Design a protein around this ligand. Structure first.
Ligand SMILES: CCCc1cc(=O)n2nc(NCc3cc(-c4ccncc4)ccc3Cl)nc2[nH]1
Ligand SMILES: [Zn+2]
Length: 361
């Protein structure tokens, strides 16, 4: 229970404090790459997404695996939804009397993620080789991923993702999403929806089996802003008497899935689940339990159980709405077959019934 879950959280804290030297190395490589990329005519306006914060850790049990997002603003973007999939869009340009450098990535009237990533990757590979103050290598592209992956010092890996930034209003598919009014208030929802949105290249293994040049909506800056300002109280987690366990529960949900994917990495059944699914379910639980008193630190075990049982319910009913785009069902059988969700249900039920053996040291 709570005492065991606390021990888990404490062990993961230890490894995070150690990797600050690794973060220093990552930041040094990323800053060199941005300086070089900004010299290119097509990537002139590239920059860090979450400029203050280099890097996230997608995988909490892999402290030496870093994730960084670059953003590239494209003004006057014209988006064309793909086959009413709600999440995937062709990117087109508006009126064309002025041509600009990004047109070198056009395929017809459509902005090609392939072409853009090819030049992106080529510049990084060149510049990585021209670095000599630290040993960094570029890893070969895996069949699906659009990310550029660097390996630093034999054990630090960095996934770099290039996102397009649009400063216009969010696409209409988001209009009924981000249902935070009863938790964080309607005016915070309005404020958040005034920020830009992002488009990222999709995986090859992602989508309808074609290699169409569609882009996927991305709201990772919104996820980050909410987690850093997450209470109903404006002073949640800013004093002794207002320490909640929201972030802890999310960490534990991520770690649960990571451990189970590892325990079963021989089989194929868990390959389609990722932190994305656990994060989505967590945010729904925050919507469902908006009071800070529902997240008291003393109740860590009960709050974590709440997150687990909600996730189990989503698996069993095969319904998990995207937090921003409610019509997109992460758990549709078009995306994950029923037997895979049934298998994960079985494993999470086993863990819950046995006080989570997959956690203990
Ligand atoms: C705060 C809740 C978690 C969250 C963070 C975030 O950054 N985003 N970004 C979107 N964009 C919409 C979208 C994304 C994907 C997707 C497919 C594959 N790998 C990732 C994402 C599939 C369908 C849809 Cl509709 N959703 C989210 N949720
Ligand atoms: Zn808090």
């Amino acid at each position: 229970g709570a005492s065991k879950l606390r021990a888990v959280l404490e062990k993961l804290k230890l490894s995070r404090d150690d990797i600050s030297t690794a973060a220093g190395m990552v930041k040094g490589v990323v800053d060199h790459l941005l300086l070089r990329l900004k010299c290119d005519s097509a990537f002139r306006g590239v920059g860090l997404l979450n400029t203050g914060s280099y890097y996230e850790h997608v995988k909490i049990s892999a402290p030496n695996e870093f994730d960084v997002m670059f953003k590239l603003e494209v003004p006057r973007i014209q988006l064309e939804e793909y086959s009413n999939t709600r999440a995937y869009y062709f990117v087109k340009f508006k009126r064309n009397p002025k041509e600009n450098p990004l047109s070198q990535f056009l395929e017809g009237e459509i902005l090609s993620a392939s072409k853009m990533l090819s030049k992106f990757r080529k510049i990084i590979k060149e510049e990585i080789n021209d670095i000599k103050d630290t040993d960094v290598i570029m890893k070969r592209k895996r069949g699906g991923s659009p990310a550029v992956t660097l390996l630093i010092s034999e054990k630090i890996s960095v996934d770099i993702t290039l996102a397009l930034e649009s400063k216009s209003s969010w696409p209409a598919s988001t209009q009924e999403g981000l249902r935070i009014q009863n938790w964080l208030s309607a005016k915070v929802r309005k404020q958040l929806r005034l920020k830009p949105f992002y488009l990222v290249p999709k995986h090859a293994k992602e989508g309808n089996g074609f290699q169409e040049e569609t882009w996927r909506l991305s709201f990772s800056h919104i996820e980050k802003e909410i987690l850093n300002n997450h209470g109903k109280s404006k002073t949640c987690c800013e004093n002794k008497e207002e320490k909640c366990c929201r972030k802890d529960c999310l960490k534990l949900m991520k770690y649960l899935l990571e451990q189970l994917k590892e325990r079963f990495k021989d089989k194929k059944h868990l390959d389609k689940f990722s932190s994305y699914h656990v994060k989505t379910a967590f945010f729904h639980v925050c919507t469902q339990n908006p009071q800070d008193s529902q997240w008291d630190r003393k109740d860590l075990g009960l709050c974590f159980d709440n997150c687990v049982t909600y996730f189990l319910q989503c698996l069993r009913t095969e319904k998990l709405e995207n937090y921003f785009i409610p019509e997109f069902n992460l758990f549709s059988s078009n995306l994950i077959d029923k037997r895979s969700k049934e298998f994960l249900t079985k494993q999470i039920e086993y863990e819950r019934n046995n006080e989570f053996p997959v956690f203990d040291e």
